[PDB]
Paper text:
The large, multidomain Nsp3 includes an ADP-ribose phosphatase domain (ADRP/MacroD), which is believed to interfere with the host immune response by removing ADP-ribose from ADP-ribosylated proteins or RNA. The well defined substrate-binding pocket is created by the C-terminal edges of the central β-strands β3, β5, β6 and β7 and the surrounding fragments, primarily loop β3–α2, the N-terminus of helix α1 and a long loop connecting β6 to α5, which contains the short 310-helix η3.
The ADRP–MES crystals also belonged to space group P21, but with a smaller unit cell and with only one protein molecule in the asymmetric unit. These crystals diffracted to 1.07 Å resolution. Two MES molecules were identified in the structure: one in the ADPr-binding pocket and another on the protein surface. The ADRP–MES complex, however, presents a somewhat different scenario, in which the 2-N-morpholine ring takes the place of the proximal ribose and a sulfonic acid substitutes for the distal phosphate. The latter group forms the hydrogen bonds observed in the ADPr complex and an additional network of solvent-facilitated contacts. The ring moiety appears to primarily be anchored by hydrophobic interactions with Phe132 and Ile131, and a hydrogen bond might potentially be present between the morpholine O atom and Asn40, although the geometry is rather unfavourable. The apo and AMP-bound forms contain the η3 element within the β6–α5 linker, while in the ADPr and MES complexes this region does not observe 310-helix parameters. With the R2 pocket empty or containing MES, Ile131 adopts the pt rotamer (p, plus, centred near +60°; t, trans, centred near 180°), while in the presence of a ribose ring it converts to the mt state (m, minus, centred near −60°). In the ADRP-APO2 and ADRP–MES structures, the last hydrogen bond is replaced by an interaction with the carbonyl group of Gly47, enhancing the proton-abstraction capabilities of the environment.
Residue numbers in the entry: 4 to 169
Amino acid sequence: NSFSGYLKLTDNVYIKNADIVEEAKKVKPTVVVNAANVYLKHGGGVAGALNKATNNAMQVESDDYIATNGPLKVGGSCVLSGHNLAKHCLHVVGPNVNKGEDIQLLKSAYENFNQHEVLLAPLLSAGIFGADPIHSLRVCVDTVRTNVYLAVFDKNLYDKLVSSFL
């Protein structure tokens, strides 16, 4: 958990302008969070990037999880191997607000983070699921009570988040 160059936003929430895949490789955190869908199909965005960095081992493992357990619920999670990225990957499903899932489920999604003392994570629902990222950060801050290190790759967004949260 050798996190470097983060800016503390609140007593437990930290942020860096960085690629989560590169952070995971440098730090090999205990837990990296994936922003997943309910069937754990890692076809793009952060999920696609994390899976690619595992050379598809994450996807094969995820398919086996679904074979045993069925799909996750929106706002739910499961813990699988982190392979070369982390000890564990916490796959968390935020709401797909652009397909009508309730934004209030973003609180339930972030509540999964509280099962782990320290996490490297992206913002949830802030890619193609369509939630405003600043809103997603505000829910993170209000909900997570463990120590979360957020990697935000887009500097334009990072600068807006730091401006809004100090």
